Design a protein around this ligand. Sequence first.
Ligand SMILES: CCCCCCCCCCCCOS(=O)(=O)O
Ligand SMILES: CCCCCCCCCCCCOS(=O)(=O)O
Lengths: 157, 157
Amino acid sequence: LIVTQTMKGLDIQKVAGTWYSLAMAASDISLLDAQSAPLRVYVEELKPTPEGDLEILLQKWENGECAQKKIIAEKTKIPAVFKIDALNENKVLVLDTDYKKYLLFCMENQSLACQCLVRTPEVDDEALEKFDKALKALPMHIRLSFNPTQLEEQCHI
Amino acid sequence: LIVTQTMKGLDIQKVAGTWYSLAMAASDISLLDAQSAPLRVYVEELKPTPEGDLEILLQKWENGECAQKKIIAEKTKIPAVFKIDALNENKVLVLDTDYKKYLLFCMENQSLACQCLVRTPEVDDEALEKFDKALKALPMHIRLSFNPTQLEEQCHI
Ligand SMILES: CCCCCCCCCCCCOS(=O)(=O)O
Ligand SMILES: CCCCCCCCCCCCOS(=O)(=O)O
């Protein structure tokens, strides 16, 4: 592991709905620098299933255009940790959430990216503070932040 | 203005010599995101002149390659503020320095980029702390950081 913050008592059902990728950070600049960078992903919505897996809808710049993406995170024995089936299986960790305003999560394979998710297209200073505090314990080298205008655009244009 | 930290008592002669661009931050992502981004510049050396102007040597990715650059910052009535002659004249502000370990500066036209400069190819946590504290009073949206290996490479490859 690298991340050692996970949320206790996570009720996955309650993260359902609309999210905005307010800020992102990664351990390597190449993970986030270009518009087409591997982990430069913009969360649209989370749909927990009844079995407790997590369907994710997001946007990614790929074809020289903003593409829709539907991916599936499978549950593990840890309620705050999920697993996506890629070539090498990537781990998703929910560090913290209050369900109604913000959610903080990291993705790790080694390399790592984290995001601050918010419910509304607004700069939540407080959620950004939690994000930054969760991150000082991590070796990040690129950090991005978006404004309310960009949050309402496809791929944060 | 946007930046309202400048260093008091700056002795420009004493910033002469070798510097490393340890961290950079900008108000807009486009200023720093790509390798060829406008303000993605890597400081090599500062040469104050006897009149008190400041010659800057730096590296910039431009031709699909890492290019050498020699630019001149002209003094103003404020010891911590200098002016580069571009199409629109850009202002350079020295926020803080201890001459021997770190220097913090911002460039502003509106948009803005700041850097944490260090003498040695080492992660100075303390200088990075000062940088981050000087920045919370600013509206930055992209932040980059480099490791010791990259600091010894041309254009931080
Ligand atoms: C509880 C938080 C939910 C996790 C948020 C989404 C993680 C997305 C991982 C994308 C990997 C790369 O995606 S790709 O389809 O473009 O290859
Ligand atoms: C005391 C600190 C000294 C200031 C550091 C250098 C500022 C460089 C501004 C580059 C502008 C863009 O440069 S360009 O030549 O590529 O167009």
